[PDB]
A paper describes a structure:
The two mutants that displayed the highest red fluorescence intensity, mPlumAYC-E16A and mPlumAYC-E16P, were further characterized. Their absorption spectra displayed three peaks centered at ∼390 nm (neutral green chromophore), ∼510 nm (anionic green chromophore), and ∼590 nm (red chromophore), similar to what is observed for mPlum. However, unlike mPlum, the highest intensity peaks for both of these mutants in the pH 7.0–9.5 range are the ∼390 nm and ∼510 nm peaks, suggesting that the majority of RFP molecules contain a green chromophore instead of a red chromophore. mPlumAYC-E16A and mPlumAYC-E16P also mature to molecules containing red chromophores that emit at 639 nm and 637 nm, respectively. Interestingly, these mutants emit at wavelengths 10–12 nm shorter than mPlum (λem = 649 nm). This is presumably because they have lost the dynamic Stokes shift resulting from the H-bonding interaction between the chromophore acylimine and Glu16. Since our mPlumAYC-E16A and mPlumAYC-E16P mutants emit at 637–639 nm, we propose that their 11–24 nm longer emission wavelengths result from the red-shifting effect of the π-stacking interaction incorporated through the AYC motif. In the mPlumAYC-E16A structure, the centroid-to-centroid distances were 4.1 Å and 4.0 Å and the interplanar angles were 11.6° and 11.1° for chains A and B, respectively. The crystal structures of mPlumAYC and mPlumAYC-E16A did not contain appreciable omit map density (contoured at 3σ) corresponding to the presence of an oxidized peptide backbone with sp2-hybridized C-alpha carbon at residue 66, which is indicative of red chromophore formation. However, these structures did show well-resolved tetrahedral sp3-hybridized C-alpha atoms at position 66, indicating green chromophores.
To create a further red-shifted monomeric RFP, we investigated whether the AYC motif could red shift the emission wavelength of the far-red emitting RFP mPlum. mPlum is a member of the mFruit family of monomeric RFPs derived from DsRed and differs from mCherry by 13 mutations (excluding N- and C-terminal tags). Its fluorescence emission wavelength (λem) of 649 nm is the longest of the mFruits and is red-shifted 38 nm compared to that of mCherry (λem = 611 nm). Ile65 and Glu16 appear to be major contributors to mPlum’s long emission wavelength as replacement of either residue results in an up to 40 nm hypsochromic shift. These residues interact through an H-bond between the side chain of Glu16 and the acylimine carbonyl oxygen atom of Ile65, and this interaction gives rise to a dynamic Stokes shift that is responsible for the far-red emission wavelength of 649 nm. Chromophore maturation in mPlum results in a mixture of protein molecules containing either the red chromophore (λ = 588 nm) or the green chromophore (peaks at 391 nm and 506 nm).
Residue numbers in the entry: 6 to 65, 69 to 220
Write the structure that this text describes.
């Protein structure tokens, strides 16, 4: 049908973190029913970034989440029109990241438009000093509320110096048509940076996500 067993995507991201503006463009591919995907991203403006790429990686794809048959796959069902999402991440040291995203399907490939704002990150923190080392696996609590599918999760970022750096995350995912919302369930994620040049202006990532 509209969602094939293999799908490519194009992504464009604009934003600002602690006042630093940037643009990122990327292309990816994956297997939406198996919950797996990879992408190649390039910082096209504002590179090299003065902050950890790790805060941007989750803002680059929910059409690729493996679901059981008895769970309506609301975000897949939303296509060809698609869906929008709005996210707020509250980090333990007061940093905040907010995101608004549009997902659409244009002639057989997914199109992602992302806007990112980060603010209040301590200048001496792991984000502005780039001391981060990738996200631990996460479980997102999914639940229907107010005509939308909501997600909530605590995410933990590994630090290069030893510890962990935590965020509280809340996201609203909204189909462009009112397709069948699921009941409550959990989506488990693993997101890895698989390749990156010295300054991270070219980065590759891989993610597996499965609803339980």
């Amino acid at each position: 049908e509209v969602i094939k067993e293999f799908m490519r995507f194009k992504a464009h991201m604009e934003g600002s973190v602690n006042g630093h503006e940037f643009e990122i463009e990327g292309e990816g591919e994956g297997r939406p029913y198996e919950g797996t995907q990879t992408a190649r991203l390039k910082v096209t403006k504002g590179g090299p970034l003065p902050f950890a790429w790790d805060i941007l990686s989750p803002q680059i794809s929910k059409a690729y989440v493996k679901h059981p048959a008895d769970i309506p796959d609301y975000l897949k069902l939303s296509f060809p029109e698609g869906f929008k999402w709005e996210r707020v991440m509250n980090f333990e040291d007061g940093g905040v990241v907010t995101v608004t995203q549009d997902s659409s399907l244009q002639d057989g490939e997914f199109i992602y438009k992302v806007k990112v704002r980060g603010t209040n990150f301590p200048s001496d923190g792991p984000v502005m000093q780039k001391k981060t080392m990738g996200w631990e696996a996460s479980s997102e609590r999914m639940y229907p509320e107010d005509g939308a599918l909501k997600g909530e999760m605590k995410m933990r970022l590994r630090l290069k110096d030893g510890g962990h750096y935590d965020a509280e995350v809340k996201t609203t995912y909204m189909a462009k048509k009112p397709v069948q919302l699921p009941g409550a369930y959990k989506a488990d994620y693993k997101l890895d940076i698989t390749s990156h040049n010295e300054d991270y202006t070219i980065v590759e990532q891989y993610e597996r996500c499965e609803g339980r």
